[PDB]
Each structure stands twice: as C-alpha cells, then as structure tokens.
Design a protein around this ligand. Structure first.
Ligand SMILES: CCCCCCCC/C=C\CCCCCCCC(=O)O[C@@H](COC(=O)CCCCCCCCCCCCCCC)COP(=O)([O-])OCC[N+](C)(C)C
Ligand SMILES: CCCCCCCC/C=C\CCCCCCCC(=O)O[C@@H](COC(=O)CCCCCCCCCCCCCCC)COP(=O)([O-])OCC[N+](C)(C)C
Ligand SMILES: CC(C)CCC[C@@H](C)[C@H]1CC[C@H]2[C@@H]3CC=C4C[C@@H](O)CC[C@]4(C)[C@H]3CC[C@]12C
Ligand SMILES: CC(C)CCC[C@@H](C)[C@H]1CC[C@H]2[C@@H]3CC=C4C[C@@H](O)CC[C@]4(C)[C@H]3CC[C@]12C
Ligand SMILES: [K+]
Ligand SMILES: [K+]
Lengths: 294, 454, 212, 174
C-alpha cells in the first residue's frame, strides 16, 4: 500500500489505458449493435521545434527536467527524516511549480498526437505518469516520497535536438555521437536510481530490517565500478532484490556494449572527414588549384 | 543408447529416489541434473511452429545451452561447497544457498568478482579454477556466431499480410534509389485521389543505404520484400493472385540493351504462368523485341496489358519536334501529375507554371452532344465549359473533320486542370509504280544501295 | 530565387491502429510474463522463511519462576543522529511450563529478541543512563511478578527447533498471504485483460469496416 | 560549484540548524566507569590508557530540561555519557589530573554566570554543545573558488574576443 503514493501513478496510467480501450471499442461496436486538434497541435510543434517560432518549449522542458533532477539529488542527500525538515521553504514548492508546468505541457500533447493509444504508450508519456501523480499526493502529508523521481533523468535524451536547433550540432555524423553519449549517461543515472531505491529500503521477507545505508552517489559509483568489470567490492549490494537487479544489469550492460561496438563507422571511419568551410581572410587574395592532385 | 546424455541424466536421478523412501529423507544429491535436459526447449517451440525460422532456432539452442550449463554448474558448487572437505572430517563447511551459487558463478564468469561471497572449501576452489577455464574456452568457441546474430537476423521480408478491402500493385525487375524515385514522387502525388493501393516491392538483392530511408519516408505504403520473381513460391507469398497489376522496371543504362529486354520477357512469362488474368505494364529498351509479347498466349492488350518502348517514345518525341520545336517538352508535361503554382513576379516562368499544371484525362461525354459534328462539340467544350478536347474513340480519331458526327458512348480526350473537372463533360444537360507501304500509312521507295547515298 | 519552395499538404491517420496495436499487445504480454515471473520469484523467496513461522505451534502456558541473573548485558542507544554509544541492562529470566510439552522453557517477546539474547526473557528499549534501563526492566518484571502462575495465557512454540524457548508473538504478520498471491496475480490479470480486450477491438474493427 | 553545492550543504545544514541559548549548570558528578583512550608516542603506538568519566548537567535557558554538556559534536559522538574527554596520556595519573583540572573550572562556577551554548531539539533534547562544528570556511570557500574560476574563464574569453575582433579592424586601418 505505502500510503498509495505508487498507486496514484499506477492507477492513473492503467485507468487511462482502459478508458482509451473501452472508448475505441464502443465507438466501433455502436455501429454493429443494430478542430483544436490542429490550431493548438501546430503551436505544439512550431513554438517547440521545426520553425523555431516564439520560444522553444522543448528548451524549457529540458531546463525544468534538469531542475527536478537537482531537487532529487538534494532530497536524496538528506537522511529521509520525514517528520520535520526545511521543505516548508522553497524545496517542495519549487518542485510543485515545475510539476504544474509539466502537467500543462502533457495536456497540450494529449490532444495532438492523433491515435491516443499510441500516445499513451510513448516513453515521455510514461515518464510523466511516473512522476506527476505522486507529487500531488505529497502535499497531503507534506513529505517528499523519494520514489520514481529519478526517472526525470530518462528525458535528457532530447539534448541532441536543442543543440540541433541552436545549429551547434549541424553535422550529420556528430549528432549520432551525441545520441549514443546521452543514452549512456541517462541509463547510468537511471539504473543507479533503481539500485538506490531497492537497496536502501530493505527486502519484504525480513520485515524491511535488511537495510544497507547507501547514498545515491555511492550507487552511481557502484554501478560504474561494476560495469567497468573492475569490482573492488568495498561497496556492493546486500539486499536479495539488489543482487537480483545487479545480475540483470551486468547482463544488460554487456548486451548493450556488444550492440553499440559496431559504431566505429561513425567514430573512426567518419569523424576524420575534414574540410568543408574555408574561412575567407579579407585583405589577402588567393588562387584555387584543382583537377588531379598527388 | 546407454551412453546418450539423456540416459545418463536419468541414471543420476531415478535410483536414489527409490532409496529415499526407506529413510523417508530427501538426499540433495544429483537432482539438479534435471536442469541438463531443458536443452530440448527448441523442439517443442518447433512443434508448436512458433520457432519456424531456420536462423532463429540456433539462437534458442545457444541461449538454452548457457542457462542450462549455468544452473547445472551452480548445482555442483552448491553440493561441493556446502558439504565440507573430507580432510577436515567435514568440519570445513561454508553455509551457502543455491541462489548464492547461481549469483557467485554469474559474478565470476562476468569477470567482475566482488569477493563478498566466494568458495572456501579446497574442492570448491579446484572446481572454480576449472569453471573459469571452461567458461572462457566456451565463450571463445561461440564468439563466432555473429553470422547468425548480426549477419542473418537482419534478413527482413517473407510474408506480406493481405489487408482485405484494399487492392494493390506489384513492382519488380530492377529497383534502385534513383529508379523508384521518379516513380514514387508521381504515384504517391498529393493531387490525385485517396487511391491508397501502393503496398509492395519485390527483387532478390537487399536494399541499400538511402533506399531504406526513402522507404521509411513512406513507411505506410511501400512494404518491400526480398525474393525472386522466377519462383512460383515467392509469387505465392506476395499474394500476386489478388494484385490489380504488376509493374516491371528495366535499367535503360544497361551494358547490352538487347540482353536486358529479352531477359525481361521471361519475367512476363513467369508472372503469366503463375496467373494469366493479371495486368502487366512493362518497359522495353529496343523496338524489335516488342513483338515477342504477342507470342505469350495469355497476353491480350485489349484487356490493358502494354509495353512502354523507350526507344520508340524517345526518338518519337524528338522526331515530332523537327516539325514544331517545344512539342517534346509539351507532351512530357501532360503525363506527370503537377500542382498549379502561383508566382507574383512577371518572369517568363510565371506563365509557364500555369501551363505545366495541365494534365491529360479522358471521360465519356454527355448524351446531349450526340448527333453533333466534332468541331461544334469542341467549341462548346471550350466556350461553355473550360476544357479542350483533342480526340475521340471510332478507334482513336484525332481532331476529326466536320464531316464526322459523334455517336453514343464515345470517349473524349481532354487536357484540363484536375481530374475533378472533366466530369462536367458527362453531366452537361441543357443548363445554358509503288510509292507507299502496303497500308498507305507511310512513304516508300525501291531499296537503295549504301554506296549511292554516302 | 527558390520560388514558393513547396506546399503544406498532408492527410494521414496511421490507417486505424498499427504501432498502437503492436505496442498494446506487446505490453500485455510483458505484463503477463512479468506477473508469472514475479509469482515464481515471490514463491520460493517468501515460502522458505514463512514455513518456519507457520510450523511454530500455539499453546496456553503458565509461569514457573522469575529471576535476576546479575550479568549486565551491553545495548546500543541512539541520540537521533549516528551515536554508536552503548549502555547496559540487567538480565531477567521468566520461565514457563508449557501446557503441551510440560517442560521448563524461557519466555521471549519475539524471535528477534530470542536471537539477540537467548539467556534473558526481555530486552528494554535501550537508553542513556543505567537507571532508565534498570527501571524499564523492573516495570516489565513487575507485570509478571504480580501475575505468577495465575491466568494461563496464549504462547507460541516449536519442538522441531527447540524444546526450551517459548514466544509471546508471531514473527510474520499476514502480509505474505495478502501480498504474495495478490500483486503478481493482479499484474497477470491486468495483462490478460489488456490482450483480450485489444484482440476484441482488433477483430471487431474489420467486421465494423465491412458493414458498409 | 555544482559539486561543492550538495556535497557541502548536506552536512552544513546540520550545524546551521543547531540553535544558540544561555544555559546554567544543574549538577556535576563522577560516574566511576574508566573509559579507554588511545595515546600516541610520536610514531605508531596503538597503546591505550584510561580516564574517569565526569558528567556536567545544564538546565537549558529555552528548553528548561536536564542535558549533558559536550565540548564539540566530535566529543559527543565519541562518548555521549561524559561531558569532557582529556587529551589521552601514558600514565593513569596524567589522565586523572587532566579531568580534575577541567572539572575544577566547573566546580568553582556552578550556576553562577549563565553562558552561551548550542542546542538542537530536532535531533536531541538532552545534549548541549559549547562550540560549533564548522568554522566559516563554507560561506568563504564554497561560493568563492569555483566562482573566481568561472570569472577568470569569462574574462579570458571576453578579453580574447576583444583582441580577435579588434585585430582585423586595426589591420584594415592602413
Ligand atoms: C528466480 C529467482 C531466484 C530466487 C531468489 C530467492 C533467493 C533467496 O531465497 O534468498 C537467499 C539469499 O541468496 C541470494 O542473495 C541470492 C540472490 C541472487 C539471485 C540470483 C539470480 C538468478 C537468476 C536465474 C537465501 O536467503 P537467506 O536464507 O537470508 O540467506 C542468507
Ligand atoms: C557532477 C556531480 C557530482 C555530484 C556527486 C559528487 C559529490 C557528492 C557530494 C557528497 C556525497 O554525497 O557524498 C556521499 C559519498 O559519496 C561517495 O563517496 C561517492 C562519490 C561518487 C562520485 C560519482 C561521480 C559521478 C559524476 C557525475 C555521501 O556522503 P556522506 O553521507 O557524508 O558519506 C558518509
Ligand atoms: C520488481 C520489483 C520492483 C519489486 C518491488 C520493489 C520495489 C519497487 C518496492 C517493493 C517493496 C517496496 C518498499 C517496501 C517498503 C518501503 C519502506 C518505506 O519506508 C519506504 C518505501 C519502501 C522502501 C518501499 C518502496 C518500493 C518497494 C521497494
Ligand atoms: C570429484 C568430486 C565429485 C569428488 C567428490 C565430491 C562429492 C561428489 C562427494 C565427495 C564427498 C561427499 C560428501 C561427504 C559427506 C556428506 C555429508 C552428508 O551430510 C551430506 C552429503 C555429503 C556432503 C557428501 C555428498 C557427496 C560428496 C560431496
Ligand atoms: K575484476
Ligand atoms: K575484483
């Protein structure tokens, strides 16, 4: 149960999935028993991408996602006191001020993407369901549930697009490197969140007596020392769930690297393709030589 | 039979169970060897026809061998490490559980090795030195399966689900990132109707670099397949019995034009053998080879089958322009589908881009025109309506003389702005010595000798 | 130079479902499999410790004697933030005669208390001064010293493990029967429902489209 | 700055949260228990000696509750039952006198002259501190050296772009 924090997210996800299923079923079956969709959708791609008009909402969504991450690093640094803390000051309020903006931005995208079933199963939709609902539960008890707030790290994948809108990443080869690099730091910070969550709060079988006192930065370190195959064993997972997840992450990590080991076509093969600008120094003059050169 | 591994795995489990009932106590001995026979998981997925693919069964074998050997070797470590060594009178126990042995062996063969749990018994260490050598020898052996996983898992295409209530064409022969380009831009044009029939492509060699990008740009209406048009087996999977037509493409940049179009005839034979009633549209590089299509007994051009001869049209348009320049660019604009475009400037191309919007269409004319002479009808089409009429079918009569009278059910050919406008012509009602060839079609003379004309 | 470029015209609908049909079926299968796998894990993970409490019997025992042992056992007391400091408490032993085993046994609050000190029938909440620990043992001792042998009472016991230790409480609450057979089962049921429901809509859609 | 932020602020908040008051002695006692301490010999002696536990209670001027005094949180964490720890030495006599001498300074000033002391009800009502655990290095060094590093970086970029843009404009002056 856990004061229904998790349940608020889980119910609002599956409830919406069942609503769409029932609606799409009955909207057809009633034939067998016997607008804003663009003028606001266009703002949802023209104020945020393609024509770059107004101010890129994607840029605000990115900055507020990082803001929520910094608040998660601060909240997870505290020893989970719960009864009393300085959250009565900005810490909690400013998170709520980002969550309302995310709710409105989700509201805009809900009407836009035509078939709502496919929109409901978009990863950026799932990442909003696993953070917005429990924040509005959190105000009742006035206490910060450290649950799935680390999934905000799962949307800094969009870092390539904003560098592509500022025309900094103009090169067709180099955007692949920024995608692959972003996937690694995003999955590393996310998986360290799961280890923190599962390892700090002990196993059910021991009535949760089986705690190992771990901090988020030690989980970021542990997962790095593990997937590098170094493994000092000065810090490691003691909870029986934590070990189970570690056996998954070792298999997953080595399967992931085996998949992306074939990008030497980008990095070694094509990063070396020099030449395509020739800055013109004024006040000098020059010739052009061409044809057959050896 | 006695030395089969599944026989050995039964001898190491059945006998001690019948001993176990005497003492009423479960000996944890070699009961983990039951894990050594889930190797047979491929066969049952192969009998349910789930693993029908010849490549994918290898992946399920290799995957099953790894999880079976992992669970088995963890059983040996549990057995040897939990019950201590003889030399210490068995006082040398380390209190280990089977799930910690599954974990230990995984953290070990991954080369991580935290050392929070590890083998203390002198037998356990001995087995661990064997399993480290065995594990790395096993992975070195199976590291050469990239032929399955990277090389052949990417072999897409072999089914083509048939969506009922739609219809489609089949395009085949010679396809490349340029050869399909001029076709797709005009076939999927925005200024035609919701004629959503384009759903297939078929040729042996796999797609390349941006051809896949061009297919992904039209993800909903391409659906390419690997497969050769000479196999009646491949034609059967492409559902060509249901198809509306079969478009055959040929490379005009060939090294020997008279080899390609001859090859291309038997593509027509293969299709007509599998199914006789399908429409064939094809292209021919030379002219003479066009006669061959009439030999194929189920080729009938009166039902729509036709051969676009590239040399015949190419030299035809050029020849026509020797009577009036620009007639080549005139006709070549009547067939490509093209939007009307506004230009605000007074540059020459402002007037040209009005002209290019004009495509050619045909439609049965209204009964109200019957019994009139052709010129009288053609005036009314251009003055009362806004359509220009070129010809009528009387078997393809172009600009008929005044002495010719229109009968019922005749087609007119029109050059007008958009297919939706021509219907006005159907709805209109009140409102308000030897010197020639044998057929006389061309000029002829007695054969010369080349020395007389150089 | 570059004319009017092009025109903004596009009219598509993903047909009706394609990517949404694939994703929703896949998700349903993932929920089915992870339901079965979670039950498979929570099975031999929870049943192995739960059998040990379940195997322990119940009885209606009586006090046999109460004593002070003398030995001052060390305990840890917290100060609200990371004090590893320690104090000490006097050992009390309360013996019971078990109503079924008719054997001398020490009482213990819970198996936790039994495992942390098998020679004493109570452990106080550990505090700073020796006086507060002493009074916290005396106060619990008093409640037995004024009710020696009168009023037989419900208690828990396990001859398979040990004849000479008796428990006042069970170690596991009813979370096992209520949560082990529930959340993976609910996860599987939601998965099955989403697959069935989606295949209903998929099969019905073509039959509705054909009705024209 | 991003590192030195949540790295330094997490411990610094705990000292910052502790309050100040003007408490008074309530009692002074000898406990009897001889606690072990380590004494060095200048090179790697792990040898130990012992000291008598003294407890000085104060009544807090705001909480009006009995609490033990402690020099600093280090001393509190290393022994929560004694209000002082001597600098540990070889002979029992030197430890005993080093407790007596500190005890004397309270025994001649019981309850007279109320004095400044530090306290935190959020953590504990019954321990009181004579000193803060962190000096002003945090406000003086956390917001300074990364900021100075950033300022020098910004200045070198701006200055160099000034010289770069000016150079072509000066070359064109001929
Ligand atoms: C299927 C899931 C397997 C069952 C997991 C339950 C393990 C368990 O009961 O706890 C065991 C812990 O021992 C461990 O910590 C081992 C945990 C590593 C799991 C290995 C994954 C194997 C996947 C293929 C035993 O618990 P315990 O008696 O507290 O041992 C001390
Ligand atoms: C750049 C971002 C930086 C933020 C993370 C670095 C600073 C962390 C602040 C201190 C901190 O939380 O220390 C923790 C320990 O932490 C460790 O000992 C592990 C350190 C892991 C470094 C991971 C680098 C990731 C780069 C990305 C806990 O400190 P404590 O509770 O006092 O420990 C007792
Ligand atoms: C398949 C996996 C996710 C099984 C579920 C593991 C995680 C998601 C669940 C299972 C048990 C749950 C924990 C059990 C109870 C507590 C103690 C509470 O004070 C903090 C939350 C915490 C720690 C819960 C967080 C979520 C939790 C850790
Ligand atoms: C080459 C290897 C197999 C040498 C033999 C090792 C194994 C198979 C043999 C050797 C010694 C044997 C063990 C010695 C005695 C005991 C104690 C008993 O209470 C459980 C069985 C157990 C633990 C035996 C199991 C089988 C055993 C472990
Ligand atoms: K290693
Ligand atoms: K190691």
């Amino acid at each position: 149960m856990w004061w229904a924090f998790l349940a608020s997210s889980m119910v609002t996800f599956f409830g919406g999935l069942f609503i769409i299923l029932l609606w799409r079923t009955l909207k057809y079956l009633w034939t067998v028993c016997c607008w804003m969709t663009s003028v606001k959708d266009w703002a949802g791609v023209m104020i945020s991408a393609q024509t770059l008009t107004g101010r890129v909402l994607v840029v605000l969504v990115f900055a507020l996602s990082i803001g929520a991450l910094v608040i998660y690093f601060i909240d997870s640094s505290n020893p989970i006191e719960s009864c009393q803390n300085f959250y009565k000051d900005f810490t909690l309020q400013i998170d709520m001020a980002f969550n309302v903006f995310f709710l409105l931005y989700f509201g805009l995208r809900f009407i836009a993407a035509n078939d709502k079933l496919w929109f409901w199963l978009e990863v950026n939709s799932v990442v909003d369901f696993f953070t917005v609902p429990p924040v509005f539960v959190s105000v009742y008890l006035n206490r910060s549930w450290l649950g799935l707030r680390f999934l905000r790290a799962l949307r800094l994948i969009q870092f390539s697009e904003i560098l592509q809108f500022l025309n900094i990443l103009k090169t067709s080869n180099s955007i692949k490197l920024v995608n692959l690099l972003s996937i690694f730091i995003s999955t590393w910070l996310t998986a360290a969140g799961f280890i923190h969550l599962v390892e700090n709060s002990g196993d059910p079988w021991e009535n949760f007596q089986n705690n190992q006192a771990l901090t988020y930065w030690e989980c970021v370190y542990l997962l790095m020392v593990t997937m590098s195959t170094v493994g000092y064993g000065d810090v490691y997972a003691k909870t029986t769930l934590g070990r189970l997840f570690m056996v998954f992450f070792i298999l997953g990590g080595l399967a992931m690297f085996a998949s992306y080991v074939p990008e030497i076509i980008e990095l070694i093969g094509n990063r070396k393709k020099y030449g395509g600008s020739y800055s013109a120094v004024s006040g000098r003059k020059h010739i052009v030589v061409c044809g057959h050169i050896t | 039979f006695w030395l089969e591994v599944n026989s050995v795995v039964d001898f190491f489990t059945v006998p001690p169970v019948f001993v176990s009932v005497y003492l009423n106590r479960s000996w944890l001995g070699l009961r983990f060897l039951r894990a050594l026979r889930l190797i047979q998981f491929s066969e049952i997925l192969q009998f349910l026809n789930i693993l029908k693919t010849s490549n994918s069964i290898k992946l399920v074998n290799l995957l099953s061998i790894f999880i079976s050997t992992w669970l088995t070797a963890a059983g040996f470590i549990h057995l040897v490490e939990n019950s201590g060594d003889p030399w210490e009178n068995f006082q040398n126990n380390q209190a280990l559980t089977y799930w910690e042995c599954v974990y230990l062996l995984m953290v070990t063969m991954s080369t991580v090795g935290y050392g929070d749990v590890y083998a203390k018994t002198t037998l356990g260490r001995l087995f661990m030195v064997f399993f480290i050598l065995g594990g790395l020898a096993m992975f070195a052996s199976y590291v050469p399966e990239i032929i399955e996983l990277i090389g052949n898992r990417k072999k897409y295409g072999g089914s083509y689900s048939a969506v009922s209530g739609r219809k489609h064409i089949v395009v085949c022969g010679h396809i490349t990132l340029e050869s399909v380009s001029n076709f797709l831009k005009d076939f999927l044009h925005k200024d035609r109707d919701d004629v959503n029939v384009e759903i297939v492509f078929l040729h042996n060699i796999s797609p390349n670099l941006e051809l896949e990008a061009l297919f992904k740009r039209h993800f909903t209406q391409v659906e390419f397949y690997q497969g050769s048009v000479l196999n009646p087996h491949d034609l059967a999977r492409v559902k060509i019995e249901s198809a509306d037509a079969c478009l055959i493409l040929a490379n005009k940049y060939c090294a020997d034009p008279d080899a390609e179009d001859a090859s291309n005839i038997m593509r027509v034979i293969s299709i007509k053998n599998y199914h006789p009633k399908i429409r064939i549209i094809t292209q021919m590089l030379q002219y003479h080879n066009k006669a061959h299509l009439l030999n194929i007994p189920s080729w009938n051009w009166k039902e729509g089958d036709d051969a676009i001869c590239l040399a015949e049209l190419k030299l035809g348009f050029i020849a026509q322009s020797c009577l009036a320049q620009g007639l080549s660019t005139m006709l070549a604009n009547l067939f490509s589908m093209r939007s009307f475009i506004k230009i605000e400037e007074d540059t020459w191309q402002k007037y040209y881009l009005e002209g290019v919007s004009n495509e050619m269409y045909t439609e049965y004319l209204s009964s109200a025109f019957v019994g009139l002479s052709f010129p009288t009808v053609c005036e009314l089409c251009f003055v009362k309506l806004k359509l220009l009429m070129i010809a009528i079918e009387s078997r393809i009569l172009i600009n008929p003389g005044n002495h010719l009278k229109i009968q019922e059910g005749t087609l007119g050919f029109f050059i007008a702005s958009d297919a939706k406008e021509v219907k006005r012509a159907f709805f209109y009602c009140k409102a308000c010595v030897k010197k020639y060839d044998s057929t006389g079609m061309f000029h002829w003379c007695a054969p010369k000798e080349i020395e007389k004309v150089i | 130079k570059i004319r009017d470029h092009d025109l903004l015209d596009k009219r598509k609908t993903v047909t009706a479902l394609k990517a949404g049909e694939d994703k929703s079926i896949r998700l349903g299968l993932f929920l089915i499999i992870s339901g079965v796998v979670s039950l498979f894990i929570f099975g031999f993970c929870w049943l192995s410790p739960a059998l040990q409490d379940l195997q322990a019997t119940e009885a209606n025992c009586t006090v046999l004697s109460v004593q002070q042992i003398g030995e001052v056992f060390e305990c840890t007391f917290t100060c609200g933030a990371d004090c590893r400091g320690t104090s000490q408490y006097p050992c009390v032993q309360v013996y019971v005669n078990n109503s079924e085993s008719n054997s001398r046994a020490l009482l213990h609050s819970d198996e936790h208390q039994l495992l942390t000190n098998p020679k004493c029938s109570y452990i106080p909440p550990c505090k700073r001064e020796n006086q507060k620990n002493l009074e916290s043992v005396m106060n619990w001792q008093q409640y037995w010293k004024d009710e020696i042998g009168s009023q037989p009472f419900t208690c828990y016991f396990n001859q398979h493990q040990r004849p000479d230790d008796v428990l006042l409480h069970r170690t596991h609450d009813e979370i096992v029967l209520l949560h082990c057979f529930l959340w993976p089962l609910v996860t599987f049921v939601v998965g099955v429902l989403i697959v069935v429901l989606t295949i209903c809509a998929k099969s019905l859609a073509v039959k509705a489209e054909a009705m024209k």
